[PDB]
Amino acid sequence: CSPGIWQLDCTHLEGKVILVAVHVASGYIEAEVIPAETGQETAYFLLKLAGRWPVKTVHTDNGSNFTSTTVKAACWWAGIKQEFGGVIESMNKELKKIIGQVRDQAEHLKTAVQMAVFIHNKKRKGYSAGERIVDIIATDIQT
Amino acid sequence: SPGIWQLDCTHLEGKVILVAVHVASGYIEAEVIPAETGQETAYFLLKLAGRWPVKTVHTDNGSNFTSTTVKAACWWAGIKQEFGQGVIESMNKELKKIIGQVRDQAEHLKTAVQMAVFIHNKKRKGYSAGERIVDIIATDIQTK
Amino acid sequence: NFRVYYRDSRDPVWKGPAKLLEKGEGAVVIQDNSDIKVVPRRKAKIIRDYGKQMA
Amino acid sequence: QNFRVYYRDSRDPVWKGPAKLLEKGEGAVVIQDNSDIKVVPRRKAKIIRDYGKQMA
Numbered sequence: 524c525s526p527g528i529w530q531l532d533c534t535h536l537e538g539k540v541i542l543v544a545v546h547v548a549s550g551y552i553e554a555e556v557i558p559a560e561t562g563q564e565t566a567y568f569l570l571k572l573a574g575r576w577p578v579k580t581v582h583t584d585n586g587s588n589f590t591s592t593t594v595k596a597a598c599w600w601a602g603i604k605q606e607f608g609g610v611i612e613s614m615n616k617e618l619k620k621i622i623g624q625v626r627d628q629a630e631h632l633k634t635a636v637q638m639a640v641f642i643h644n645k646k647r648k649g650y651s652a653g654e655r656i657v658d659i660i661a662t663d664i665q666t
Numbered sequence: 667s668p669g670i671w672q673l674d675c676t677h678l679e680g681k682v683i684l685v686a687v688h689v690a691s692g693y694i695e696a697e698v699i700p701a702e703t704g705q706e707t708a709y710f711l712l713k714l715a716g717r718w719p720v721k722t723v724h725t726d727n728g729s730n731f732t733s734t735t736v737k738a739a740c741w742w743a744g745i746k747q748e749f750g751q752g753v754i755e756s757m758n759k760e761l762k763k764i765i766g767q768v769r770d771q772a773e774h775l776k777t778a779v780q781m782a783v784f785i786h787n788k789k790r791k792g793y794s795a796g797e798r799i800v801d802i803i804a805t806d807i808q809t810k
Numbered sequence: 811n812f813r814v815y816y817r818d819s820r821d822p823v824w825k826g827p828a829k830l831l832e833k834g835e836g837a838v839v840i841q842d843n844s845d846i847k848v849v850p851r852r853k854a855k856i857i858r859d860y861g862k863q864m865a
Numbered sequence: 866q867n868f869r870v871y872y873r874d875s876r877d878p879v880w881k882g883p884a885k886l887l888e889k890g891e892g893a894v895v896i897q898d899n900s901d902i903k904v905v906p907r908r909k910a911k912i913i914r915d916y917g918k919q920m921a
């Protein structure tokens with residue numbers, strides 16, 4: 524897979540919206556609890572992600588927040604190609620499993636989400652997802 | 667060395683911007699946080715610790731950085747704290763400079779902050795800061 | 811390098827992306843599909859591939 | 866080793882600790898803070914493990 528392809532999707536827990544991004548080639552993920560499942564929140568999440576990693580292509584479903592004009596504006600500003608229409612779907616299930624494992628270690632869901640992201644990215648198989656994405660991108664960097 | 671970070675807060679438009687810089691690379695991350703508290707600082711650290719190998723954080727003695735909540739987060743994530751160079755202070759000025767250049771391109775400050783972080787990390791020298799941190803960390807992974 | 815997003819027919823949702831043809835101090839001239847439109851500056855958002863250029 | 870407890874007592878809102886975890890009940894926890902043994906209700910105690918540290 525290309526080092527610049529990401530999949531984004533939303534999942535829900537305890538009445539709150541969780542926006543999840545996965546680097547397809549590595550399995551590395553990032554997640555945020557967002558106050559509303561809107562294009563404004565999705566566009567802000569993408570600009571943060573695009574500043575951290577080389578984000579060239581994002582694949583989402585046709586959720587209204589992902590097709591919003593605000594997201595189109597952010598992707599044009601950051602140089603991100605959008606494509607519409609199971610890695611992230613299975614990742615939502617994996618994230619929810621890890622959240623439940625550590626849920627009692629935190630009062631707020633947002634804390635447990637970031638605990639679960641930590642565990643997912645640091646767990647070794649071997650390399651961890653966090654080690655794989657760093658390795659994949661560094662190899663892609665030209666001399 | 668690839669796990670050393672400097673964190674500090676700066677202010678614009680009455681709002682608090684929490685900035686983390688990977689000292690060895692100059693790579694930065696920034697968030698506008700609703701309050702300059704240990705609660706918000708600890709949440710920022712847990713997110714940061716999940717992205718990068720964060721082993722040591724250098725801050726000043728701001729109450730949010732010395733708070734018990736942050737000590738709790740650092741204990742959970744395995745982060746060593748050290749208090750009391752100028753890299754982050756000089757980075758706050760650099761970040762504010764880029765924010766003003768792109769401020770009119772966005773209504774909300776939080777949007778301009780993330781535009782400025784993008785520009786700082788993608789700008790070529792040469793390598794960019796975003797390329798350097800990935801290179802530094804990957805080199806420490808592949809050589810072990 | 812430029813894409814324009816805009817509002818016009820009393821529709822609050824931002825339309826576009828449109829091609830930027832000319833930029834005046836009070837309005838911009840854009841092309842969306844086969845229709846050429848004149849949009850006031852306050853009702854238009856000219857967005858640059860600014861981050862894209864910093865590659 | 867693996868557990869640190871932060872707590873509030875004496876009507877003081879600032880979190881004290883870290884304290885050693887002796888026992889965790891559903892209603893209270895038994896802790897030791899610098900030779901002092903204390904019993905603290907669950908809502909006034911936060912038991913934090915180096916879970917991420919060990920998992921990483």
Ligand SMILES: O=C(O)Cc1c(-c2ccccc2)c2cc(Cl)ccc2[nH]c1=O
Binds near residue numbers: 632634705734735742
């Ligand atoms: O419970 C939450 O979701 C986070 C949280 C923590 C905390 C921070 C890191 C790991 C686990 C919990 C906390 C910790 C202390 Cl020592 C005091 C107040 C605190 N208040 C909070 O809200």
Ligand SMILES: O=C(O)Cc1c(-c2ccccc2)c2cc(Cl)ccc2[nH]c1=O
Binds near residue numbers: 593596597600855
């Ligand atoms: O102005 C902000 O701070 C972000 C923002 C954008 C925007 C997003 C990325 C780059 C530039 C502006 C926006 C864009 C459109 Cl086409 C419609 C509504 C919008 N509303 C917003 O709030």
Ligand SMILES: [Mg+2]
Binds near residue numbers: 532533584586
């Ligand atoms: Mg979906």
Ligand SMILES: [Mg+2]
Binds near residue numbers: 674726
């Ligand atoms: Mg400071």
